[PDB]
Amino acid sequence: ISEFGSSRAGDKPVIGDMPAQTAPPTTANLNAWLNTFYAAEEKRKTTFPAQLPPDAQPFDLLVINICSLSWSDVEAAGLMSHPLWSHFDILFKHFNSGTSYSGPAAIRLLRASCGQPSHTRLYQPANNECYLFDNLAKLGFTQHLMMDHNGEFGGFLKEVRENGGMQSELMNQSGLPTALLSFDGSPVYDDLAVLNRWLTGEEREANSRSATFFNLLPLHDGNHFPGVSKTADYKIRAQKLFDELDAFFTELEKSGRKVMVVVVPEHGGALKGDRMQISGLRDIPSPSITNVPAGVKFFGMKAPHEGAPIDINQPSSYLAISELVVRAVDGKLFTEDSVNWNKLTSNLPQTAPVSENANAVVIQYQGKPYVRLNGGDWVPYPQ
Ligand SMILES: [Zn+2]
């Protein structure tokens, strides 16, 4: 409503998804903006239904959470035209991962059903309604945890269990082929083999509903082919991963199963360095590191999406993934003769691109990036 417009009697105040940035960019104003962002975010949640309707349709949710993959990395690797990108139904162009470290990224994704917390708040219990997989478990979705690695490094599996709330045994990894040896010496299993094992298991369950969290490490720095001294080239590993995901999408299409696949990277690999951070360093969660390619694809729909993916251009983060899940949770979109793809992809929650690690916050303010180290004065991020 403009200055000489009127609201209607009884109108609620309109709550914007992103707090305004009209004040000049001083330390005090950027500090105040961040506190305003935290306040607004803490009031945001996806509301799941109390129970599924009796005519709900079972399907499987598979969340594919990829370490060390940002749009900047895809560009630097020369992989923007890989066929995988064109295979999604929905593709986010300004999805912010909120952090540049793996543990906090996974916790943020597991807490996708509420607005974005400060880094501090990630490591304290959240409201039960914030845990996406718990919301689904409540509605009868079997929970699965899957990885292409053992989760030992960095206490990652412990963080997923303790702070992410995912209290499920790691799916059996015995007999899987090894694709890489990790920077810590342990195996990174072949992703197509992990996904095919998942697909056989789900196929054993029938018209079950299930929700799987799958974390993938092949793009992490320091990974090598067994016996090879040098770190495998990033673009070779990324091509291999994208070819395996595309092959799996083909397998999923052939299966006829109803599946919602969400691909959401944790954070970038810092393949292309910048003034402050040489290639591979990611202690500051810069815009390049945190703008990641998130996508959604539906399989087994009576009326599948045709043509190129629907681009979501607005600033987004995990809350938008949770909203797409609740829009799908009754399974009815899978059996509709005609889907309103506009409505399905419109009015998704927008989230300002704020990113944090324990010691640093990065924001965009009036279109420019700033960093705050340990609660001190804001400084322009040097890009
Ligand atoms: Zn990671």
From Swiss-Prot:
- Where does this polypeptide localize? Cell membrane
Coiled-coil residue windows: none
Keyword set includes Membrane: yes
**Taxonomic superkingdom:** Bacteria
| A GO biological-process term | cellulose biosynthetic process
Q: Does the keyword Ribonucleoprotein apply?
A: no
> What's in the keyword line of the UniProt record?
Cell membrane, Cellulose biosynthesis, Membrane, Transmembrane, Transmembrane helix
Q: Which topology term describes how it sits in the membrane?
A: Multi-pass membrane protein
- Mainly localized where? membrane
Q: Name one GO cellular component term.
A: plasma membrane
Describe its function.
Required for cellulose biosynthesis.
User: What is the official name of this protein in its record?
Assistant: Cellulose biosynthesis protein BcsG
* UniProt source species: Salmonella typhimurium (strain LT2 / SGSC1412 / ATCC 700720)
This protein's encoding gene:
bcsG
